[PDB]
């Protein structure tokens, strides 16, 4: 277990920002991606997780440039990547995203790295959009030592990722015409019966409904935060945050399976 930060309530975890200072800066030469931000907590007081976050296809940085400060403020080195194409289909992306924690990695054995010493390269977690989430579930099929996955508006031209065993939370969004939740986000819930799973369904959310400029960052960051402490950080005082139904006039739809309280 790896600990950080004081005890989460409610509050702490609704709110804009968590206990560290975060700041950023844009990765010189990406290797293996398009170009790349890294947001890092400058007072964690110990060496943190890496996830990496892709956006959706046609999408940039932006549509996911959010979960960079809210999820760093709580101790964690969060690299959000543009695509080499915006064009690029979802075994591309997951590629990317995992070039993306491989330069992470490389980031914090460099000595001029603003994150040199801040990471611990054996915990690493995956996010992402749409193409970007689908690409999510392929890294976490293909690299089993992932801590945590947490797409949004999942697609994927399969629905089956039955042999996942990262604790996966997907975010969906209720009336998405993009992705439809009947026929994507929800048959790749349901095909995974091997990992903690967890289902949030935003009301009356459409395809972009956890991107940057959301309604409900009060929810979806405090579900994010919860699930990545719980499952990157191994930190049982999450366990309640990251497992409970959230009880909220904002969730459609809440499942969850071998997620203990």
């Keep these: 277990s790896h600990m950080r930060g004081p005890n989460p309530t ?5 709110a804009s920002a968590g206990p560290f200072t975060v ?7 990406p290797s293996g991606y398009g170009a790349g931000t890294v947001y890092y907590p400058t007072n964690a007081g110990g060496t943190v ?3 990496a976050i ?7 940085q932006s549509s996911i440039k959010w979960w960079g400060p809210r999820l760093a403020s709580h101790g964690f080195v969060v690299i959000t990547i543009d695509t080499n194409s915006t064009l690029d289909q979802p075994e591309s992306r997951s590629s990317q995203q995992m070039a993306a924690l491989r330069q992470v990695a490389s980031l914090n054995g460099t000595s001029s790295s603003p994150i040199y010493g801040k990471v611990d390269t054996a915990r690493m977690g995956v996010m992402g959009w749409s193409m970007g989430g689908g690409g999510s579930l392929i890294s976490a099929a293909n690299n089993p030592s992932l801590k945590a996955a947490a797409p949004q508006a999942p697609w994927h031209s399969s629905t089956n990722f039955s042999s996942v065993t990262v604790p996966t939370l997907i975010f969906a969004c209720e009336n998405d ?7 994507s986000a929800l048959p790749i819930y349901d095909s995974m019966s091997r990992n903690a799973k967890q289902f ?10 956890a991107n940057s400029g959301n309604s409900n960052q009060a929810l979806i960051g405090k579900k994010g935060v919860a ?8 930190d049982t005082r999450y366990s309640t945050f990251a497992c409970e139904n959230p009880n909220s006039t904002a969730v459609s739809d809440f499942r969850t399976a071998n997620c203990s309280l």
């Design 10 to 14: 409610a509050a702490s975890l609704e």
């Design 200 to 209: 949030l369904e935003i009301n009356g959310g459409s395809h972009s409904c």
């Design 227 to 234: 699930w990545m402490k719980r499952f990157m950080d191994n």
């Design 54 to 60: 892709v956006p959706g296809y046609t999408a940039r």
């Design 177 to 183: 015409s993009i992705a439809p939740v009947n026929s």
């Design 49 to 51: 997780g890496a996830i």
């Design 23 to 29: 700041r950023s800066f844009t990765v010189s030469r």
